[PDB]
């Protein structure tokens, strides 16, 4: 289940965008790599309610809709 992660990572550009979006809606950040902060972020699902998935993919569609569908048609 790790092949969609690096996928979304390189389909972004700016990583801080959806993190700032996720803000107050969180310490993974000491991890040095930029995609590191991504990969652990999807291990946080138990702390993610329905509204959280909603937040991620709504920010994704409010960014680029094809990315929302790409995660969706999976």
């Amino acid at each position: 289940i790790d092949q969609h992660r690096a996928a979304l990572i390189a389909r972004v550009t700016n990583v801080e965008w959806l993190l700032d979006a996720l803000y107050g809606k969180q310490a993974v950040r000491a991890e040095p790599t930029n995609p590191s902060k991504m990969r652990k972020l999807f291990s946080f699902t138990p702390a993610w309610n329905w509204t959280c998935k909603d937040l991620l993919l709504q920010a994704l569609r409010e960014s680029q809709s094809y990315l929302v569908e790409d995660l969706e048609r999976s």
Binding site: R11, Q64, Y66, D70, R73
Partner: protein, 107 residues
């Protein structure tokens, strides 16, 4: 011997069009994704195997269209409303093997 034949390039006036096509040869194509890039070197189109999941680089939105011919060995690039900034070497590329390319000159 891995083969990819890039073609369909040329010189055009903006608003105008170019049709790029790459012809795969030597291995089984349809189980692999096929891509186009243009030149740093910036990826342009990526079409996953099977035809379902399409991904376009942000220069290509609503203009460029990557298409798939699996019957076999053809991958299409449809460029409408060409621009000089997008005039470049179009590289058809799959699996560590990039095509020799095509020349696109827009003006």
């Amino acid at each position: 011997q891995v083969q990819l034949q890039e073609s369909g390039g040329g010189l055009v006036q903006p608003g105008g069009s170019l049709k790029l096509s790459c012809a795969a040869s030597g291995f089984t194509f349809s189980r692999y994704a096929m891509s186009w890039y243009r030149q740093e070197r910036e990826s342009v189109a990526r079409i996953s195997s099977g035809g379902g999941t399409i991904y376009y680089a942000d220069s290509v939105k609503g203009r460029f269209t990557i298409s798939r011919e699996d019957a076999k060995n053809t991958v299409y690039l449809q460029m409408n409303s060409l621009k000089p900034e997008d005039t470049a070497v179009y590289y058809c590329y799959v699996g560590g093997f990039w095509g020799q390319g095509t020349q696109v000159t827009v003006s």
